[PDB]
Design a binder for this molecule. Structure first.
Ligand code: CO
Ligand code: CO
Ligand code: FE
Ligand code: FE
Lengths: 275, 276
């Protein structure tokens, strides 16, 4: 029945120390060690399920980068996003003959700039988000805090567009969204509140969408290599190991949030789908 | 009780500033290969000559730490090089104050990192006070022959062989009144598995909090708080820092960081005097 699509929403670059912390430490021999600006894919996942279309993540807002962009210049220069018009989410969905208003559920893994970019589009969906992540982002907004990963203007848009929210409580069990689609409540780690997705496809079988719970295969290991972007180190480690257990017990693949090698090997919306 | 508190200079260490201050200098689009720096910082310990008995806070690095025949692994020596003279060695610092290791009643181990638990093995007449989670963590690295850089296998080996007398601070244990005006602070998990601090109330100087690696430097402390790269429990670290700030305010105490070069220079070291 279900069809799962991988949509390419462009690329982002940043200090590798964000991705893998202390990836290249200074030594007595390399006292002035240098980092690297690494490139990684931003992507989203559409599940065209009989019970309704489910969208996982929403990438960046088209009006993010640029001198007249939503992102602060310090953010733009730290986490530059590069994307043709075909990469924009609205376009990727159009290509699939899917309108925003057709989306029943949006699962926001978290509310970082490269995941919650286009939430404002989905005014007919229920937006599922971790309550702690929602609280965290709302505070940034209210306190006009200068947090690089949370876009004041994006949040401003969510409120103005009157999105319909469904917060996953801190100690809430996983949610059965649809047949073979379960929202996993990962809790605090990479961010305040992380959500994942387990999808059971008839043919493909089990998929875990880990998002930023696991940046890359290098993150996953073993051994685990945590990021520099991190709120709760203990929770982050617990989440990874938990994912590892779930993958084993359910014989699922783990789809990382920003692994280039894996993304290349994915079947994109333009090419086809998983079923 | 009219005690005397000594700061002993146990050398200097250097390491990537990212260890000390996480993401201190992130690469950007127009600076994509941003480079880090190798910052130098002091290793010190504190002796409290107290009428009820002598209390030592931290023990610095082991004399046979560095070198080809050293206890530290080469990768450790290269990432966290320790430079010190014979006078900087704790045993010598104590000797110059006419103190023998056997005269130490209590050793408080802030944690069991290489630069704080180096010389525990000296104090075979003392009760070593350590956080149980820290002790457990270190013992695991030992038993698993794990290669954690901050935990020295040979140091731990020595503690066991010397039959040290331990007193573990339990995870949910209250502060310990060690002596009049000396309280062991249970900071719990953060920088490491289990952090201990000290609150000292001196007649003349007033209140001092020894934070060790709960707070690396004034830069760490802020505000704003700038967390380290060497972290186990991020949330616990931040809670601890905020807790120290509150205690400091309420008790009107100075906060002595673990490795603040500037603060260290201002201290009256053991070669010059003490704090009453
Ligand atoms: Co993120
Ligand atoms: Co330490
Ligand atoms: Fe991300
Ligand atoms: Fe230290």
């Amino acid at each position: 029945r279900p069809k799962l699509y991988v949509m390419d929403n462009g690329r982002m670059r940043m200090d590798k120390n964000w991705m893998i912390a202390m990836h290249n430490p200074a030594t007595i021999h390399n006292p002035n060690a240098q980092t690297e600006f690494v490139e990684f894919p931003i992507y989203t996942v559409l599940i065209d399920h009989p019970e309704g279309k489910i969208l996982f993540d929403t990438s960046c807002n088209p009006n993010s980068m640029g001198p007249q962009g939503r992102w602060a210049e310090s953010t733009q220069q730290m986490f530059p996003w590069t994307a043709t018009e075909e990469c924009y989410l609205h376009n990727r969905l159009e290509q699939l003959k899917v309108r925003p208003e057709d989306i029943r559920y949006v699962v926001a893994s978290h509310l970082h700039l490269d995941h919650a970019g286009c939430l404002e589009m989905f005014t007919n969906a229920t937006i599922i988000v971790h309550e702690d992540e929602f609280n965290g982002a709302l505070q940034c907004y209210a306190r006009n805090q200068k947090e690089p990963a949370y876009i004041w203007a994006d949040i401003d848009a969510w409120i103005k567009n009157n999105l319909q929210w469904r917060t996953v409580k801190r100690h809430e069990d996983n949610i059965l969204l649809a047949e073979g689609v379960k929202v996993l409540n990962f809790g605090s780690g990479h961010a305040w509140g992380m959500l994942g997705l387990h999808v059971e496809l008839p043919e493909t079988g089990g998929i875990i969408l880990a998002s930023d719970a696991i940046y890359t295969a290098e993150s996953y290991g073993p051994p685990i290599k945590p990021p520099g972007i991190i709120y709760d180190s203990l929770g982050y480690m617990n989440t990874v190991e938990r994912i590892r257990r779930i993958a084993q017990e359910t014989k699922s693949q783990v789809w990382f949030g920003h692994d280039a090698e894996q993304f290349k090997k994915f079947r994109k919306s333009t090419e086809g789908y998983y079923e």
